[PDB]
């Protein structure tokens, strides 16, 4: 179902951000962790997807770190 897939994806997303050297002491990392936690605790998909939008936007805002077109190939 979508519910388990979204939560699985959010763990992958936080791991991807971790490998991109988002400093663990930074405000941004605490925000990412909190979003990850909220997604895992979410009870409906609407809440989970809204939080995933915020969490994924962290990755999309890192310029030069990832090329989205090549990853979507």
């Amino acid at each position: 179902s979508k519910m388990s897939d979204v939560k699985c994806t959010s763990v992958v997303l936080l791991s991807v951000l971790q490998q991109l050297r988002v400093e663990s002491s930074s405000k941004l990392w605490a925000q990412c962790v909190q979003l990850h936690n909220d997604i895992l605790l979410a009870k409906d998909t609407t809440e989970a997807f809204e939080k995933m939008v915020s969490l994924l936007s962290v990755l999309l805002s890192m310029q030069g770190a990832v090329d989205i077109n090549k990853l979507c190939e």
Binding site: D5, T9, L13, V16, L28, K51, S54, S57, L60, L71
Partner: protein, 116 residues
Amino acid sequence: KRAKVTSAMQTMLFTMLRKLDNDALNNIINNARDGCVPLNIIPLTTAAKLMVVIPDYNTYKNTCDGTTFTYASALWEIQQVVDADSKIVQLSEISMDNSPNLAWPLIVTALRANSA
């Protein structure tokens, strides 16, 4: 090896995102593929600003209408537009006639219109 693992994990991530097929995720992903990327974390409360790069007029007319900016399946009220030369752009200037005279890309600063 570390670079290959990172590439593999990132590629699987967007494959998983594609299979989720959520409208809001697809919007920010497809916008990012066109160079329309956020500059900060997308907020869910109106008490935080959003900044997005708008690479060209074609993107602008597909996401902006007057003072309203449509992005991530939500409405945002525009507070500022700056051009590539970091000069303020009036919303009246961003028309179909004056667009060739603007310095693209533009950066839009907006406040969320409604809660998520």
